[PDB]
mmCIF file of C-alpha atoms and ligand atoms in Angstrom:
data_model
loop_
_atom_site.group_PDB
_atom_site.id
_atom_site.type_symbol
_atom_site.label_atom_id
_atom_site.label_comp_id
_atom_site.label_asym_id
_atom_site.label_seq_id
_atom_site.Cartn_x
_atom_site.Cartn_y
_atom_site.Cartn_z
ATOM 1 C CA UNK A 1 -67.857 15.333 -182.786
ATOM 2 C CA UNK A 2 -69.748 15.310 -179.412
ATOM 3 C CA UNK A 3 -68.599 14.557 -175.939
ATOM 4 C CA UNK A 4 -65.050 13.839 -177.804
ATOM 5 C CA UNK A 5 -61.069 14.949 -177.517
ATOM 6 C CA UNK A 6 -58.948 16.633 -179.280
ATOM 7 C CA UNK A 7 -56.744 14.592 -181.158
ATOM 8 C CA UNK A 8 -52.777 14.694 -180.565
ATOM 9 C CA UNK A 9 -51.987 16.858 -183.554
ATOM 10 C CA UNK A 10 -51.026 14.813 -186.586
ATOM 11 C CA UNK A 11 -51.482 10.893 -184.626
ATOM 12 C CA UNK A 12 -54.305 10.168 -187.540
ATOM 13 C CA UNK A 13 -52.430 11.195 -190.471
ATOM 14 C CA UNK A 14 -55.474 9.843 -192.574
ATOM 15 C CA UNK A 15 -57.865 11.898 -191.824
ATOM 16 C CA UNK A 16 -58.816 14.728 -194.783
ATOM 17 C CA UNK A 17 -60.893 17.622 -194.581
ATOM 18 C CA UNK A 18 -62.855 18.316 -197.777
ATOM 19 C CA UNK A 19 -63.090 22.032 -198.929
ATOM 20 C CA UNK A 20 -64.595 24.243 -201.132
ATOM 21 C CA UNK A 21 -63.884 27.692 -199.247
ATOM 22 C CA UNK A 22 -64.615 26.187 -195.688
ATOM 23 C CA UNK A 23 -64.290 23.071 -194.226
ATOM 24 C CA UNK A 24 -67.492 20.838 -195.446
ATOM 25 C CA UNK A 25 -67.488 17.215 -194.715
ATOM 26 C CA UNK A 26 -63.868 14.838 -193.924
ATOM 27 C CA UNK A 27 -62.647 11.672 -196.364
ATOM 28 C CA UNK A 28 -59.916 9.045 -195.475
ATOM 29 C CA UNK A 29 -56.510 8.484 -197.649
ATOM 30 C CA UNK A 30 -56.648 5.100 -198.055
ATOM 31 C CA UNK A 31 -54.111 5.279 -200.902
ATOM 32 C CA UNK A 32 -51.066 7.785 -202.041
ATOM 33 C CA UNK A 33 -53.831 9.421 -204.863
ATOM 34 C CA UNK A 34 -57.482 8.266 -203.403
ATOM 35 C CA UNK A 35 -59.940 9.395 -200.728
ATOM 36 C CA UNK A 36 -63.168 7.466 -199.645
ATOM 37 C CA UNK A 37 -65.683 9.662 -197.833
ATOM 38 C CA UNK A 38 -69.914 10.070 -198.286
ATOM 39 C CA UNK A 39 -71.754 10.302 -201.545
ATOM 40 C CA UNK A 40 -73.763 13.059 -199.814
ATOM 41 C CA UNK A 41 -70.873 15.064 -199.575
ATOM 42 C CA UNK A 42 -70.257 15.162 -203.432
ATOM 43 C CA UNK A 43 -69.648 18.412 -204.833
ATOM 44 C CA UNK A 44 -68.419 19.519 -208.704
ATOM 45 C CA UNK A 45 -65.107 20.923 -207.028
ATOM 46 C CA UNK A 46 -63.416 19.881 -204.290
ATOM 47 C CA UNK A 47 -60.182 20.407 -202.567
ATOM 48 C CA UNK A 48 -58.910 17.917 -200.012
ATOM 49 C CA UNK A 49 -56.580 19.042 -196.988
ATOM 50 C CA UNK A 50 -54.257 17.058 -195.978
ATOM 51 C CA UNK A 51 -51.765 16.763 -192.831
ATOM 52 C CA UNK A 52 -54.629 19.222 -190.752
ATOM 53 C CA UNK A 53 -55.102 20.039 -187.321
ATOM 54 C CA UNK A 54 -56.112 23.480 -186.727
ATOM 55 C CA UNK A 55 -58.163 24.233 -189.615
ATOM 56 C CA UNK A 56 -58.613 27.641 -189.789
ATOM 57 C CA UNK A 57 -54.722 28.677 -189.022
ATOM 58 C CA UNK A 58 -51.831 27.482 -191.206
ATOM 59 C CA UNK A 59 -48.996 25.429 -188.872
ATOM 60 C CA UNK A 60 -46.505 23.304 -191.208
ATOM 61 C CA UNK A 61 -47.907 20.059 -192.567
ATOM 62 C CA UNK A 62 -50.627 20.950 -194.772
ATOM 63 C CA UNK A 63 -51.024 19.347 -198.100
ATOM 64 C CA UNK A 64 -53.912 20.994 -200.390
ATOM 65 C CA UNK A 65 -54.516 19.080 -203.767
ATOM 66 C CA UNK A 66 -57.797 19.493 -205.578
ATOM 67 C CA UNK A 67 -59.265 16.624 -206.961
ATOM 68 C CA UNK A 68 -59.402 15.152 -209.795
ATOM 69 C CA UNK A 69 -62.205 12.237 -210.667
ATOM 70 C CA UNK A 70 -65.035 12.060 -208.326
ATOM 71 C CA UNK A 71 -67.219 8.748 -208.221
ATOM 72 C CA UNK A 72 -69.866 8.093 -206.046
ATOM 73 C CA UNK A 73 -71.119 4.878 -206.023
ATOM 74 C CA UNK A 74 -73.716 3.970 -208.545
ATOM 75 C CA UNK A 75 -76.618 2.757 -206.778
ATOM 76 C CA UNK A 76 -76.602 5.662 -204.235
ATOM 77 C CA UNK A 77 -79.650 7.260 -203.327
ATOM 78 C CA UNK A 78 -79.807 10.971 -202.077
ATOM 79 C CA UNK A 79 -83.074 10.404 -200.483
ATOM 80 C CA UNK A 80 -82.293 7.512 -198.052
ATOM 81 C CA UNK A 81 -78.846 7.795 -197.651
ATOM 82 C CA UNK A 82 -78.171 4.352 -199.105
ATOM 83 C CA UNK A 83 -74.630 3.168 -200.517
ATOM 84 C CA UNK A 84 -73.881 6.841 -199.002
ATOM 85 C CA UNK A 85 -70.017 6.413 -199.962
ATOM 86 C CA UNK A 86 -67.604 8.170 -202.575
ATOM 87 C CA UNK A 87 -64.367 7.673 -204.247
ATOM 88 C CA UNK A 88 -62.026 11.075 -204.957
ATOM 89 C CA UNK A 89 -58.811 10.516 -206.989
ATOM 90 C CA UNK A 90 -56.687 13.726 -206.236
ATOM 91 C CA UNK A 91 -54.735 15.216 -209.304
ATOM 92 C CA UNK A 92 -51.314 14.523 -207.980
ATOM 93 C CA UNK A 93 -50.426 11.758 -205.448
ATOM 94 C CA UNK A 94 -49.789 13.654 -201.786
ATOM 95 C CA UNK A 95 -46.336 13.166 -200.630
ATOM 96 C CA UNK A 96 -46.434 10.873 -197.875
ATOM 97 C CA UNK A 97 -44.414 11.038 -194.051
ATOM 98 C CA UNK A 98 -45.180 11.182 -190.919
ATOM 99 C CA UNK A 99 -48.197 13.041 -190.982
ATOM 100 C CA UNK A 100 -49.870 12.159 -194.195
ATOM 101 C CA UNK A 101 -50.186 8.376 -194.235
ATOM 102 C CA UNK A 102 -52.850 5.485 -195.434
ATOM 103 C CA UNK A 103 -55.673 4.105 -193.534
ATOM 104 C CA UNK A 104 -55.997 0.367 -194.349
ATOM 105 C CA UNK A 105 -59.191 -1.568 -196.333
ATOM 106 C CA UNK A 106 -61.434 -4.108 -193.634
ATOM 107 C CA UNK A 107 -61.008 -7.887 -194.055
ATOM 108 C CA UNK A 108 -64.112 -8.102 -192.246
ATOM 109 C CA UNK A 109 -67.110 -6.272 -190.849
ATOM 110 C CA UNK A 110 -66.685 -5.137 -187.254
ATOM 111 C CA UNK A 111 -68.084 -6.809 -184.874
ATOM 112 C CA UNK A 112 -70.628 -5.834 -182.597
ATOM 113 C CA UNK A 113 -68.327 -3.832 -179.432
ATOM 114 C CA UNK A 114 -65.274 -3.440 -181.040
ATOM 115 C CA UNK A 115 -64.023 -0.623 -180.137
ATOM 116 C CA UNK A 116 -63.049 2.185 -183.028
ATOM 117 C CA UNK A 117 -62.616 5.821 -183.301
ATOM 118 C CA UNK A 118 -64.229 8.292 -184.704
ATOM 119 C CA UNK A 119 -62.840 11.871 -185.925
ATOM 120 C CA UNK A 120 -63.459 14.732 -186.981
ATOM 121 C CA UNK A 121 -64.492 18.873 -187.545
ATOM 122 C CA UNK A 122 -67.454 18.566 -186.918
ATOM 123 C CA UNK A 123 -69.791 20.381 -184.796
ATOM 124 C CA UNK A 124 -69.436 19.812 -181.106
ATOM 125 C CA UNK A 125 -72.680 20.734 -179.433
ATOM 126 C CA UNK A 126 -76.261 18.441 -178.981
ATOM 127 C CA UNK A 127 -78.078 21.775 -180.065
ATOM 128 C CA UNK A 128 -76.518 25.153 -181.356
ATOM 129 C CA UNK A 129 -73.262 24.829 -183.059
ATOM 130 C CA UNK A 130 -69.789 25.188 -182.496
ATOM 131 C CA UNK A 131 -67.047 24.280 -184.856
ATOM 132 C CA UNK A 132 -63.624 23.096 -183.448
ATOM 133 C CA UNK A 133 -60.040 24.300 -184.968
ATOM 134 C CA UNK A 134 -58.932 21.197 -184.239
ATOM 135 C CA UNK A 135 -59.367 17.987 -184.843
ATOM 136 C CA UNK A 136 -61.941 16.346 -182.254
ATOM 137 C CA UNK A 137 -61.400 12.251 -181.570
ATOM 138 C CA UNK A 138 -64.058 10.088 -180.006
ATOM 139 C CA UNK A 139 -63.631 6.405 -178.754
ATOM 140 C CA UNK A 140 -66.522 4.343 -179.538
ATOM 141 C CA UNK A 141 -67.745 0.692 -180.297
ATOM 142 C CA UNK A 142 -69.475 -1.021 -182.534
ATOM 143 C CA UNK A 143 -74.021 -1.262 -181.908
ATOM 144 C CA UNK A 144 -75.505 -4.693 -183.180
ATOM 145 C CA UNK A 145 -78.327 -4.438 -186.047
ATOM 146 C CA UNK A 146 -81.063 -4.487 -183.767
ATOM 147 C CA UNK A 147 -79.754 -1.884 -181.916
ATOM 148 C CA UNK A 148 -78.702 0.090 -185.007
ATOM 149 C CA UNK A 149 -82.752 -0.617 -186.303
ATOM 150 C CA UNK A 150 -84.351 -0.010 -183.143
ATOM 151 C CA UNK A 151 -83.167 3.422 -183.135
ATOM 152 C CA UNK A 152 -84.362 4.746 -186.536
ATOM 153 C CA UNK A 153 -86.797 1.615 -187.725
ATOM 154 C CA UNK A 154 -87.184 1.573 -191.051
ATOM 155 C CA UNK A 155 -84.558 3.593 -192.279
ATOM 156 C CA UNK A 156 -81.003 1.506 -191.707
ATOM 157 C CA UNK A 157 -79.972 -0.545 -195.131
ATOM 158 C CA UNK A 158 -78.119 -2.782 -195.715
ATOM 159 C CA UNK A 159 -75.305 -0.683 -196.471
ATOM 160 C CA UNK A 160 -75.382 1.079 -192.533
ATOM 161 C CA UNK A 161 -74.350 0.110 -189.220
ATOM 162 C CA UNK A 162 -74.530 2.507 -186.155
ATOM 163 C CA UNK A 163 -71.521 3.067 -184.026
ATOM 164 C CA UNK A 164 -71.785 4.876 -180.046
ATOM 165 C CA UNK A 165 -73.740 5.287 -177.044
ATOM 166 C CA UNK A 166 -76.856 4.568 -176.595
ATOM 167 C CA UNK A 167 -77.296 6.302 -173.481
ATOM 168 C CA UNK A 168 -76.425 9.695 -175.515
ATOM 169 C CA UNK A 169 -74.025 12.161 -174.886
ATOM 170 C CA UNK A 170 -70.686 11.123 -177.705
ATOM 171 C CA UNK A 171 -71.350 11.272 -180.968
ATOM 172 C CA UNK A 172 -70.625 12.050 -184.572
ATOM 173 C CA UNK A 173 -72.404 15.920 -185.759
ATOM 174 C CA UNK A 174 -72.458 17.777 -188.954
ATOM 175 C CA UNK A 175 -69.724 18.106 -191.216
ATOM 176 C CA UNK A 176 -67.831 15.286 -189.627
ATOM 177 C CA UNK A 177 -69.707 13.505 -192.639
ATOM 178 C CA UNK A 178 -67.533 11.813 -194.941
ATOM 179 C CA UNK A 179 -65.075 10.903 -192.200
ATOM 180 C CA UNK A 180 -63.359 7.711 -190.965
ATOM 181 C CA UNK A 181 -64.453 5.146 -188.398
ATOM 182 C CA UNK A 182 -61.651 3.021 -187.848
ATOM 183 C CA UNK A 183 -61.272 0.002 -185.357
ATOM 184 C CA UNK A 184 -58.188 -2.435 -184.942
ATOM 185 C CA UNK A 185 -55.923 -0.137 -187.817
ATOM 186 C CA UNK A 186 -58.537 -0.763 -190.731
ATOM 187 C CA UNK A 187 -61.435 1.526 -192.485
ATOM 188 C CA UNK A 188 -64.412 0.158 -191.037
ATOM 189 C CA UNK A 189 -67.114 2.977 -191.331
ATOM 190 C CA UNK A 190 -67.990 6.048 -193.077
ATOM 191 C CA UNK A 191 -69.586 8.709 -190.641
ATOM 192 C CA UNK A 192 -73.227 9.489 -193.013
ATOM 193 C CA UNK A 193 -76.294 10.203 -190.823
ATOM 194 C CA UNK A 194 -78.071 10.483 -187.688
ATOM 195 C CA UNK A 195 -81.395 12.048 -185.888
ATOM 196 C CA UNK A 196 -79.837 14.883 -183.803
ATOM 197 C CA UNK A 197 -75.726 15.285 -182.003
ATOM 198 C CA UNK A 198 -75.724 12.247 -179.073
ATOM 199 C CA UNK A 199 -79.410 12.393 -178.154
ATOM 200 C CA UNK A 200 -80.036 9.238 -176.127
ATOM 201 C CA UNK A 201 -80.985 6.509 -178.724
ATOM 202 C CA UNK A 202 -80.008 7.863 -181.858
ATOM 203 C CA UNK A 203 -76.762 7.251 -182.408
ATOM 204 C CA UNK A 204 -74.869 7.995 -185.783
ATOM 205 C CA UNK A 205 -75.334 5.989 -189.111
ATOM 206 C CA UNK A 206 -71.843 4.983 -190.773
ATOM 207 C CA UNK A 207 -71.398 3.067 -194.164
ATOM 208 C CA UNK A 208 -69.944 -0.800 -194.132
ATOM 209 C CA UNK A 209 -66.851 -0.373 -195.715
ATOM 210 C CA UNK A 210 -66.389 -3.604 -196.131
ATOM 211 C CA UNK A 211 -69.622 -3.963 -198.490
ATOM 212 C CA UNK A 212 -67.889 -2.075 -200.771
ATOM 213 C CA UNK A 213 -63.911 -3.656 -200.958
ATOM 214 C CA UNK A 214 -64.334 -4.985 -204.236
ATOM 215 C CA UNK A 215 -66.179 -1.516 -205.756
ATOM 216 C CA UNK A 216 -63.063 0.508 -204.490
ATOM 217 C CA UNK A 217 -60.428 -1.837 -205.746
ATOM 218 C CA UNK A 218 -61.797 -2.743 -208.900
ATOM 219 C CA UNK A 219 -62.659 1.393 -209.469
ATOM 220 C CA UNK A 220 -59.136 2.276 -208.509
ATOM 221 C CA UNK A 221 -57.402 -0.490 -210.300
ATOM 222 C CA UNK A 222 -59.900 0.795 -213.528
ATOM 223 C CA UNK A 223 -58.761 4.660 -212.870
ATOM 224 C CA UNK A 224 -54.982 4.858 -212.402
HETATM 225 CA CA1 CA B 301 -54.071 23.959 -190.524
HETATM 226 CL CL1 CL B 302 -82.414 9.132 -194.049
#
């Protein structure tokens, strides 16, 4: 995350971090055993970490559990990024309190400057890196379509929507992939892709959620 905060330690207990010896992309807990995140981030093994701030330094809450099933969604395309979302069932269900909690399913897409929030490890810098240890928080709203396909014309499906600033500056970065966008308490967006960290214009790509309610309840209904 770019131009963000850091995030009161533990106030979005949904948030995962996906790892496979380092911290690679983030996923939401939307349910006791299940994580939705990108189907670019899909890897043979994966562990999810759960209850993280700091990252790279143990502190108390920390749930790892390695998963179990991995689904991306079927008509997802590695080239364009479309139906860029992913199911992971962990092997046990995490334990669930104050810091580990469930991120609810959209009745609705979000509309055009609703205000959500972003999250993430992700790379905070517009050019170079810099990785945080902990977890960075950006408030942001909702871009309309013609926004969203003014900015990168030709590429935005009808799986994406684009979520920030036009005028640059706060954004989602690499390896905040995966992550949640959520506005008004519910899973809205997926953070997938974008053309450069908060350059002016090109704001991040996230996946509708809400395209995809029936997929995740029907494959999780299917799989338990
Ligand atoms: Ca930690
Ligand atoms: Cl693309």
């Amino acid at each position: 995350i770019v131009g963000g905060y850091t995030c009161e330690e533990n106030s979005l207990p949904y948030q995962v971090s996906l790892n496979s010896g380092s911290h690679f992309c983030g996923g939401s807990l939307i349910s006791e055993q299940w994580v939705v995140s990108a189907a670019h981030c899909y890897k043979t093994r994966i562990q999810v970490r759960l209850g993280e701030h700091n990252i790279k330094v143990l502190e108390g809450n920390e749930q790892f559990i390695n998963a179990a099933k991995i689904i991306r969604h079927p008509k997802y395309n590695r080239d364009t990024l479309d139906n860029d979302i992913m199911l992971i069932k962990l092997s046990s269900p995490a334990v669930i309190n104050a810091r580990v909690s469930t991120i609810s399913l959209p009745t609705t897409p979000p509309a055009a400057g609703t205000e959500c929030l972003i999250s993430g490890w992700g790379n905070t810098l517009s050019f170079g890196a810099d990785y945080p240890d902990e977890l960075k928080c950006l408030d942001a709203p909702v871009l309309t379509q013609a926004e969203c396909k003014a900015s990168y014309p030709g590429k935005i499906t009808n799986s994406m929507f684009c979520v920030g600033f036009l005028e640059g500056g706060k954004d989602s970065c690499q390896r905040d992939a995966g992550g949640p966008v959520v506005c008004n308490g519910q899973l809205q967006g997926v953070v997938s892709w974008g053309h450069g960290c908060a350059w002016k214009n090109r704001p991040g790509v996230y996946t509708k959620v809400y395209n995809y309610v029936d997929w995740i309840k029907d494959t999780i209904a299917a799989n338990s």
